[PDB]
Amino acid sequence: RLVQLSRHSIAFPSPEGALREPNGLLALGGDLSPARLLMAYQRGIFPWFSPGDPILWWSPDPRAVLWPESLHISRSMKRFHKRSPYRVTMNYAFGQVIEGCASDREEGTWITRGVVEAYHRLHELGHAHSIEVWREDELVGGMYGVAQGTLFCGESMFSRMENASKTALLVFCEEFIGHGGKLIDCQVLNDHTASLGACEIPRRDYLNYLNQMRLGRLPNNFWVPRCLFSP
Template sequence: MRIVKLSPQSLAFPSPEGALRDPNGLLAIGGDLTPSRLLAAYERGIFPWYSPGEAILWWSPDPRAVMFPAEHHVSRSLKRFLRANPFRITLNQDFAAVIAACAYRPDEGTWIGPEVQQAYLQLHQQGHAHSVEVWQEDKLVGGLYGVAQGALFCGESMFSRTTNASKCALMAFCRHFAAYGGELVDCQVLNAHTASLGAKEIPRRQFLQLLSHLQRRVLAPECWQSQVIPPHPVEPPSPTN
């Protein structure tokens, strides 16, 4: 197994099965972040991740962290929190602000540099990348963004500036996505935070099989229209005697 250097004249990627085991999933180096190359990568279960100023690295880890939206569990404490209705949650109303907020990590550093932000903003303008925004009054306090592949959503990053904001963004998105036929959210690599939100690991081969099946599904255009997403399910009124 070796890292493949991408050709600037071709959008071809090597098979994910050839990715390194250490570091887990490293597959290729080079290329660019044009919309066509990014889409070619996501269509094959590959994503970019690298430090600003360095060569672009392309990954397809094994195992893969995923979340099944229909199975997303909301804890009792979060349900109680939501009853207070502290947030307004929207879809595709300020993608640029969301990705900029995801990039702002002064204590950790970030891979989401200006080049990356511009690349995904182009994907958003073309209808491939989407954002969820969490508002407290008129202030953006949380959100997430990623790339759609039919009935699969490739989550890229999320942020939170107040308690439970990112959890509420993900919960509301999972419910909305599932309602339109979405079946899988790609979380890429499992960590303590994604695990606490319900992500689990599956073999890369299984993920690629699901990707091949789900990316052919076409969701209704209304799924991705700019809109308000209810922060919690609308419950029917209690029956009266």
């Protein structure tokens, strides 16, 4: 059954109880406060809803996921990256990035003003991180998400220049993999997610990786704002 959240509790219902159709719908209401969001991510839940509607929480089954090493990179893209015109930094402009994704008319709809301020908050508290792609001094691409130990929950990505988000993702994965990263959550499997090399795994499996991975960890300074790639 669909649980109505309220200001009284920050907890969530067991995901095993999410609806079948729409795939994942678990609860609604509450708010997008930091503590509630973390509470959600740690239980394999995430918010998604359009402007005007109440907050919706999901935990779909199967779950979209991306194993860093299985990231698909075309022969063409490698040639591009070997002579990349982009620079990739970490946590330099979280705001510009999420704003870029929100700006995307075709996919940024669910990124309302309330969602933006919410994740910016998680960013300032150090749980949300952004990968930025620069061409000269102009942000032309990026991605962002929530970290859970060796698990990364991908929120969204955007691009204003050819191959910008592929670079963000290509570089992040190298970094992530090289320091102990394990999995990237793509939430739902679709044309975009599938093109990156994401695959579906049962929810029960995702939750078990979740509880396992948020306990594991990366270098003390892994999420510190820095440059990840420069030509």
